[PDB]
């Protein structure tokens, strides 16, 4: 029993099978196994492993080693020559099993290539080995370096060349590799069985061949036809992969954000939150001429239950729950500390920051709480490091909830608001109050002493009530014993009176509907003569001005872009990555963006009133939308799915394996674009549950099990259905799948009309079962009259179809059942049945009553749908000429092994699949409807049990159809039946589902920029929510063996892909692109994702690379809005791709950030018009700034999410 | 190979076996789909070779073959071969 | 091959038996009931003493020893029986 120790430490030999990565996590490559137990093999014969050619054969593999990142793992390897099998077991669990010798007379033709069966097209493009691991990885294997051995691979991937490393187990799986790249279903799938595999070394050194580098290479192929892969010396047979549950845990979160416009003043927040109004009306109907669980309501409750007037202080100083603390709890008094207004406040205190790190200290933090909210509000900022310090009145102040201030990057501090701050605190940029709750000593001396220990140019918020305001009043009739939290309250004009005879002055005032307000100030810069630089020409020959003026390191004047003439100007983005950039703290910018055309434009001249406030106020960003100075701010996306109401629904598990996450989603087809003769929409009233369905939710069997061409992000759950077609009729159908929705999209010839006496509840129980027990019997079975059946399992609902059938014939019959209520139920169904032809479902003992009862003869026809050992039992109970039906699935994807002795009793064996019909052999499957419809019309066929549940309640009736308890079928009830037989208004009600991105197949879609990585993933992505004609735009065409290969599958697929190669820089070359789209059909979406990049330092760019890094992206957005506004009624997307460059800043690439900040202005612009249009902010895409990569899936999956919302700028990214 | 080459890797609907061992292995791996397997050897079936399930996971069906069941007595069933060997 | 619950019996490298072998978890006695005959042959007058049992077997081809001869007594259609222990 050899035993081998696999290590990954770098020391080690084996360290290379740290590249074998899939899903994120290390295995052990399936040709390790046959590694080691070639060694093995050859320890034992005495022979070295290069001079042992070895041949293995029904290689099985039961599990995947799980190589851990520190620590080692143990392989036995156990050899029977005498059966030449072996076996590899780790930690006493088998692993791999099969059959391994020697090979006693190599023959060399067998490597030879197989014939090919293309004409040798010596097409100019192959697949390189960057776009072949490209593409491997988009499925989800990561190898690395070392697994890394093809070189070139034929667009088909029936060819290529193969590295050679003198390392087997890398040689192998990359042949491996190779036989998975030409197969055309997506997803992960893993090796399980092989039938044979030769290996010859000698052969292989004769046809190693050194290229004119060093490097040796080796000539593989592989042929479907024949099943077999061969490359030098190497010949694999017989292949199969079964797919992987493709699921990784601790997968990204990307933060989603909106970018929309903010004023600096705003009021009336909370005017919306009705709990926030509901709380203040109760608390002045408490306070009329001077009953909840808040803490102010409370409060106002005890001060009336002890005096209804004139409490005496004492009494109500010292009330349990009083001074306590809890008091900020209120609703009201944290209104605005939820709401954005505090982290747009928050973002407008980060920007202006000379350095990305910020100095944040807080005062009276004891009794403001605004530690536990400040730090979980700039975390999303990537680089962001930021120095907090917690300041109270006395230590045993904020005492507790140390462990609160351990887990966050706080501090505890002493520093009373009248005494001067500590030295270690000293000059500070954010300081934060929270007034509201906290009492500070006095107005003028706190401030006063704040803004000592401010630093210069830093920001002071001031969270407080305002005294004139009812609220105001109630908190002021209120502890009066705190004549601290007394001087604390003040009107807005005294707030402005304090703030004027200190430096500070305001910039921003969030403001409640009932009172509460947020005032954020800063201490003015000493000032200095500014410089104004317009920005608004054209040909950016302002550029030049710009790496002038900044040249002067010594100066420290601020400069100023001034841009007014353009409302899409992206000085925005061009700002934000200039200030990272050396010399960008000077920069501050002023923009001119109305929205409408009717808005006032106000004057920005130097002598203009609006021009000496804004440079009072001296922030960096300063953007004026519609009578209203603001910044575009940054806010967390709901995290809420949208859902909208819709007639046409499907159920689905939005997480793969999890009953908690079923739910409806829209249905593709509410477009009712695949319509057509052969085909028809029926509405669904009930559909029965299966146990496939079951199956599929529990996430044990995979989608691509089922049979057929499937989407990868779709649905298959339901086969059977009952409810009306088009006409109106009372109508019971079958279908592969997606049978589990408000409508279906259905062949007629698997429609059969409910008769008259039925209910169309009765009727979703019958398609599946009676069709399956009617083929397997009749048809595959050929059962005649007065023979003898066992039918396994006669609950379920095959079991009582075949049993109606049979007994209709005569056919004694045996059966067996999992419990004595299934028993009675069974008997008291079918009077005919007596005591005798009742066994135990659970345990073979039904064998030895079949035997017995039957005088040792056996059955005449089995209808086996158990598994393993009690499949096998089920064997042995065959007579003579005997027939076995098996309608289970679980051996049969085992493979396990079956003794060919029983065929000499002269039985037959069928495999019954009744999916085939859907897919193919649709001429014979006529045979079993016209059986089917003979049953209902002659009265064999009866409607199961049912047991109904509402559509609202689908999770329940899965969690029913899990437990074994269930008998008969369980069917989803979808819409209530009408007492009517024939209704025209078939038409579902409406549903409100998950709302999902579908496209209809009569519309042409653009996607400019097209062939690169992203385009060619994107169109991909739309080609699987029904895109039939498409248009791609490249500035060169194709030029790469990938994008020849994806344009050549989508064609081949009937899709309608055109590349046009029309620059959208040029109006022109818009209205071409514009109308060659028109002629596949009316255009329906664009996408804009043209990119040149030229980036570097403002010091190193010219006026040149800002044209052409704006040519695409800028002006092609401009040209593609305006042709699109003019020749596009049926428009529905205009998206345009920005980057998280421009709303963060990167230094380098301000021409970049330029141009996207452009892009997402004229989005904006087309939205207040009510047109279609949406930016969407990548952080980084992997597969194809503080950041890190973004997986392809969780990019698509995000854009799905955008595609649906009513913003207009969106942003996703992953920190670091 | 040949059998798969010349069906466009599909395979044969019908296979009559009277091979043994191994090459009844390879006569069942060219079966199709919706295909039938005619076992009329002997030597696999007395030594009870095993047989690989994974096969009728294709709808397929396999007949084990005995002509010398009906040669006991006559039957309803041999009649039938005797008017298709007469009719032919 | 404990993994593989399988054992092989070798001669001179040459398979000689092979098959599954495992202990038995949960051994339950009523297995061992005897299953009742489908003739009750209810006289049961004559049986085959054990000289007779051993008579037919050498007739038959079977030369078993003192030591082999456990059969003490059989039904005459063999339906039976009662067999001796001899701690082997
Ligand atoms: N050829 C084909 O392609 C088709 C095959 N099928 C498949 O055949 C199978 C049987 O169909 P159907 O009878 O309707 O399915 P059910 O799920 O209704 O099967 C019910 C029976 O299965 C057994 N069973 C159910 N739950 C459990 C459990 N938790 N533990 C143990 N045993 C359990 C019991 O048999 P018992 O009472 O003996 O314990 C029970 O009576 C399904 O997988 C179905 O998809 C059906 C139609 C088409
Ligand atoms: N990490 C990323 O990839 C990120 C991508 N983005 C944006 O996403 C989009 C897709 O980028 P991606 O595909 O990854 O990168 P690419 O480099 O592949 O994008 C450029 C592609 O667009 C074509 N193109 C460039 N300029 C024009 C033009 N004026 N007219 C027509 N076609 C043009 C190019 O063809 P040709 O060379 O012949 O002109 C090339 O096919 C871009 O807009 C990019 O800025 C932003 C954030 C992150």
Redesign the pocket.
């Known amino acids: 029993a050899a035993i081998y120790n696999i290590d990954t430490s770098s020391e080690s030999p084996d360290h290379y099978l740290v590249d074998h990565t899939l899903d994120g996590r290390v295995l052990f490559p399936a040709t390790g196994y046959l590694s080691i137990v070639w060694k093995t093999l050859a320890r034992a014969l005495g022979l070295g492993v290069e001079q042992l050619p070895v041949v293995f054969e029904d290689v099985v593999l039961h599990q995947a080693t799980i190589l851990p990142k520190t620590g080692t793992v143990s392989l036995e390897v156990r050899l029977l020559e005498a059966s030449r099998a072996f076996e590899v077991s780790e930690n006493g669990n088998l692993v791999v099993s099969g059959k391994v010798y020697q090979w006693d007379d190599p023959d060399p033709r067998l490597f030879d290539h197989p014939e090919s069966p293309t004409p040798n097209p010596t097409e100019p493009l192959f697949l390189a080995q960057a776009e072949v691991y490209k593409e491997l990885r988009l499925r989800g294997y990561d190898y690395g370096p070392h697994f890394q051995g093809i070189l070139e691979a034929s667009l088909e991937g029936d060819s290529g060349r193969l590295l050679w490393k003198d390392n087997w187990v890398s040689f192998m799986d990359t042949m491996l590799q190779m036989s998975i790249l030409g197969s055309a279903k997506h997803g992960l799938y893993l090796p399980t069985r092989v039938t044979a595999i030769h290996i010859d070394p000698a052969t292989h050194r004769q046809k190693l061949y050194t290229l004119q580098d060093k490097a040796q290479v080796a000539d593989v192929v592989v042929s479907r036809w024949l099943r077999v892969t061969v490359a030098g010396g190497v010949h694999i047979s017989g292949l199969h992969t079964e797919s992987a549950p493709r699921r990784q845990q601790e997968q990204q979160v990307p933060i989603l954000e909106k970018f929309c416009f903010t004023p600096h003043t705003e009021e009336g927040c909370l005017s919306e939150r009705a709990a926030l109004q509901e709380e203040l009306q109760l608390c002045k109907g408490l306070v009329q001429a001077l009953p909840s669980q808040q803490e102010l309501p409370r409060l106002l409750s005890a001060a009336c239950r002890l005096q209804l007037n004139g409490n005496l202080q004492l009494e109500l100083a010292q009330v349990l729950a009083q001074e306590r603390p809890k008091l900020p709890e209120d609703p009201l008094l944290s209104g605005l500390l939820d709401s954005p207004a505090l982290k747009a406040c928050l973002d407008t205190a980060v920007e202006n920051m000379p350095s990305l790190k910020m100095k944040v200290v807080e005062v009276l933090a004891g009794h403001g709480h605004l530690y536990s909210r400040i730090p979980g509000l700039l975390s999303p900022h990537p680089l962001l490091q930021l120095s907090y310090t917690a300041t109270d009145r006395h230590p045993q102040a904020l005492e507790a909830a140390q462990a609160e201030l351990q887990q966050h990057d706080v501090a505890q501090g002493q520093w009373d608001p009248a005494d001067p701050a500590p030295s270690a605190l000293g000059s500070a940029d954010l300081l934060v109050c929270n007034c509201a709750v906290a009492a500070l000593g006095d107005p003028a001396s706190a401030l006063s002493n704040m803004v000592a220990a401010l630093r210069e140019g830093g920001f002071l918020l001031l969270h407080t009530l305002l005294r004139g305001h009812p609220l105001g009043d109630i908190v002021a009739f209120l502890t009066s014993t705190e004549p601290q939290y007394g001087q604390g309250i003040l009107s807005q004009d005294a707030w402005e009176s304090l703030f004027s005879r200190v430096s500070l002055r305001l910039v921003g005032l969030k403001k409640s509907f009932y009172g509460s307000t947020l005032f954020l100030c800063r201490r003015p810069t000493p000032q200095d003569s500014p410089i104004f630089l317009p920005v608004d020409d054209t040909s950016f020959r302002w550029v030049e001005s710009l790496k002038g003026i900044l040249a002067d390191e010594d100066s420290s004047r601020p400069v100023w872009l001034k841009a007014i003439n353009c409302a899409t100007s992206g000085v925005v983005g061009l700002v934000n990555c200039l200030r990272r950039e050396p010399g960008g703290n000077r920069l501050r910018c002023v923009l001119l963006s109305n929205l409408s055309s009717t808005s006032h434009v106000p004057e920005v001249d130097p002598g203009s009133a609006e021009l000496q406030k804004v440079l009072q106020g001296d922030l960096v960003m300063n953007v004026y939308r519609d009578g209203a100075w603001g910044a575009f701010r940054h806010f967390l996306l709901e995290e809420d799915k949208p859902e909208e109401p819709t007639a046409h629904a499907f159920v689905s598990t939005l997480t793969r394996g999890d009953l908690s996450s079923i739910r409806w989603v829209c249905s593709s087809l509410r477009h009712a674009q695949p319509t057509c003769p052969g085909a028809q929409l029926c509405t669904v009233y009930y559909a029965s549950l299966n146990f496939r369905d079951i199956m599929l939710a529990t996430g044990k069997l995979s989608p691509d099990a089922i049979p057929g061409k499937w989407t990868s992000q779709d649905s298959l759950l339901g086969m059977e259905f009952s409810g009306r077609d088009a006409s109106g009729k009372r109508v019971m159908g079958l279908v592969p799948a997606k049978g589990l929705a408000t409508s279906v999209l259905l062949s007629p010839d698997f429609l059969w009309d409910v008769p008259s006496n039925w209910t169309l509840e009765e009727a979703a129980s019958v398609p599946v079962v009676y069709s399956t027990a009617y083929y397997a019997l009749v048809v595959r079975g050929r059962v005649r009259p007065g023979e003898t059946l066992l039918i396994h399992s006669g609950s379920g609902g095959v079991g009582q179809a075949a049993i109606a059938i049979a007994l209709s014939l005569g056919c004694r019959v045996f059966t067996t059942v999992g419990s004595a209520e299934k028993r009675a139920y069974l008997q008291a169904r079918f009077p005919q049945l007596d005591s005798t032809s009742f066994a135990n479902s659970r345990d073979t003992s039904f064998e030895q009553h079949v035997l017995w009862h039957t005088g040792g003869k056996g059955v005449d026809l089995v209808l086996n749908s158990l598994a393993e050992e009690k499949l096998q039992a089920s064997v042995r109970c065959l007579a003579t000429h005997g027939r076995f039906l098996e309608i289970g699935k679980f051996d049969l994807s085992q493979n396990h092994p079956l003794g060919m002795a029983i065929f000499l009793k002269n039985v037959t064996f069928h495999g019954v699949l009744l999916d085939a019909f859907f897919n193919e052999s649709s001429a014979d499957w006529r045979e079993v409807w016209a059986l089917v419809q003979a049953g209902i019309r002659d009265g064999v066929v009866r409607p199961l049990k049912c047991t109904v549940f509402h559509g609202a309640q689908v999770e329940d009736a899965f969690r029913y159809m899990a437990q074994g308890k269930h008998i008969g079928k369980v069917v989803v009830q979808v819409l209530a039946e009408e007492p009517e037989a024939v209704l025209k208004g078939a038409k579902p009600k409406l549903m409100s589902a998950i709302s999902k991105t579908f496209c209809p197949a009569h519309k042409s879609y653009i996607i400019?920029?097209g062939?690169?990585?992203?385009?060619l993933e994107l169109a991909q992505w739309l080609i699987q929510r029904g895109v039939q004609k498409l248009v791609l735009?490249?500035?060169?065409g194709i030029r790469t063996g990938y994008q020849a290969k994806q344009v050549r599958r989508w064609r081949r697929q009937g899709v309608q892909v055109q590349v046009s190669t029309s620059?959208?820089?040029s109006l022109e070359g818009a209205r071409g692109l514009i109308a060659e789209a028109a002629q596949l059909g009316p255009v329906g979406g664009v996408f804009n994702?043209?990119?040149?990049l030229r980036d570097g330092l403002l010091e190193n760019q010219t006026p040149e690379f800002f044209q052409d890094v704006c040519?695409?992206?800028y002006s092609?957005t401009l040209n593609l809005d305006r042709v699109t506004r003019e020749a596009c009624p049926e428009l529905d997307y205009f998206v345009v791709?920005s980057?998280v460059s421009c709303g963060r800043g990167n230094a380098g690439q301000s021409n970049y950030g330029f141009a996207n900040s452009a892009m997402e202005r004229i989005c904006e612009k087309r939205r207040h018009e009510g047109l279609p249009g949406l930016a969407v902010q990548?952080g980084?895409?992997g597969d194809?700034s503080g950041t890190l990569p973004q997986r392809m899936a969780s990019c698509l999956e995000v854009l799905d999410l955008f595609l649906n919302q009513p913003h207009m700028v969106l942003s996703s990214f992953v920190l670091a």
Request: hydrophobic content about 45%; glycine content about 18%; overall charge positive.
């Open positions: 400019a920029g062939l690169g990585g992203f385009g735009t490249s500035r060169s620059n959208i820089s994702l043209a990119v040149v040519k695409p992206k092609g791709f980057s990548w980084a895409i194809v």
